[PDB]
Subunit: 114 residues, 4 copies
Amino acid sequence: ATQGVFTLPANTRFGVTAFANSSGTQTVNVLVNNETAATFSGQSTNNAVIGTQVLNSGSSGKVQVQVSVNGRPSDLVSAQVILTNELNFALVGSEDGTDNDYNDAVVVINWPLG
Amino acid sequence: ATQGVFTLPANTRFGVTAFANSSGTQTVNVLVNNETAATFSGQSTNNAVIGTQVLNSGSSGKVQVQVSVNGRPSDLVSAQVILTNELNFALVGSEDGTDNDYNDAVVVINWPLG
Amino acid sequence: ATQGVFTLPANTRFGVTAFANSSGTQTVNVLVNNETAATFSGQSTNNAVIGTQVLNSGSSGKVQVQVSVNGRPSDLVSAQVILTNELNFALVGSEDGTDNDYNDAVVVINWPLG
Amino acid sequence: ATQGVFTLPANTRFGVTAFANSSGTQTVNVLVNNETAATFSGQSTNNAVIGTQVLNSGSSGKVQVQVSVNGRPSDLVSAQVILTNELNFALVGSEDGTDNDYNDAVVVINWPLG
Ligand SMILES: C[C@@H]1O[C@H](O)[C@@H](O)[C@H](O)[C@@H]1O
Ligand SMILES: C[C@@H]1O[C@H](O)[C@@H](O)[C@H](O)[C@@H]1O
Ligand SMILES: C[C@@H]1O[C@H](O)[C@@H](O)[C@H](O)[C@@H]1O
Ligand SMILES: C[C@@H]1O[C@H](O)[C@@H](O)[C@H](O)[C@@H]1O
Ligand SMILES: [Ca+2]
Ligand SMILES: [Ca+2]
Ligand SMILES: [Ca+2]
Ligand SMILES: [Ca+2]
Ligand SMILES: [Ca+2]
Ligand SMILES: [Ca+2]
Ligand SMILES: [Ca+2]
Ligand SMILES: [Ca+2]
């Protein structure tokens, strides 16, 4: 099934933050309304943040996360969780190798902000 | 119901990160086996990542998140989600007022690391 | 924080299913647009399905789950999770006693159907 | 990533319930420690419960859900959610066609019981 794609409310601000846990340099692309809106790049084997930014969900609200290492796409796992019918988390895990810990690049999208 | 309490696998390293979205200064305490192991604080209405740290769950694996503003405990909401039976996220939201956005202090705990 | 309240897309069919795990008789009331649409009453310590129906979220899309035992409201815990940005589950747990297992009456709402 | 596989606590009773939403007859196989423990077969386009039962996770605690239609394995999506650090839901969606509603066979596993 498709992973890393989330429908957020339209024209709404959201936070996107990426953490790295791999020997490989992670490249996290965030697409909004089918256009690259942000790109984070970094390396860490200790969960360091490699990027955090506030973006706008665009006209459709479609937000997609893609992760690659040196141009090679990582396999993704994702889900959205809503607490007290109002607080949203769009979560993404990614695997750049074969140990399947899926934490090589961990991406957290949260809204609302402010 | 109790919120902000999570049982992690024993003696496991995990990351804990806090975000702020409020006019009030947030203070986040992370307890391991009932004793504070990390504290973050900051003031942002733009999702600033006010703190992050790597901790060890210890023999009990018990982790609890508490959020306060000016010495007043915020109301918490939380849940744990596991992706592909391996990637874990312990999520916490908090409300320091009455506008019910529950994002005043958002905390994300993730494991495994590395 | 408020629990057991979910905002579903309007005029959408959804399933609601209740399970019982307690010595006490569980009364599960499902409100759609603030009006009772279904009620299940049963006792089991072995997860019997005390009720399962298909309801329409109506014009409001507001769905609320209430659980009581002999007229006394149970404390609720809830969350919504979305898989592959399309499959939705609204989850509810409830506690009627002191052991805090929150499974005394478990309710699962799922959509879309068909 | 692999989907439909969950690690439950050892020797623990859990509930498994399957719903159908497809023109095709769904065959849901529930494996415990890599051995078939239960099978639900049925057809419905109205979320009918095609099976509900109580199983034991055994020593390994390994539980896997497989879904097929006409012998063809459906594509699965899954996640585990834990509320108030006590109530567990292992959720599975499956797609037997191309409309990607992933509700063709919906499986809900919950524990603890009692
Ligand atoms: C150190 C190793 O680097 C990799 O690329 C990762 O796939 C492994 O999970 C691990 O983090
Ligand atoms: C600016 C406001 O600050 C308050 O303290 C928060 O409770 C509100 O949600 C909002 O962030
Ligand atoms: C048998 C007991 O019944 C009580 O009413 C419940 O609160 C307990 O969790 C347990 O199920
Ligand atoms: C009636 C249709 O049956 C197909 O086989 C399913 O894939 C569709 O989602 C739909 O339920
Ligand atoms: Ca890896
Ligand atoms: Ca890794
Ligand atoms: Ca607030
Ligand atoms: Ca706020
Ligand atoms: Ca109880
Ligand atoms: Ca119980
Ligand atoms: Ca389908
Ligand atoms: Ca279907």
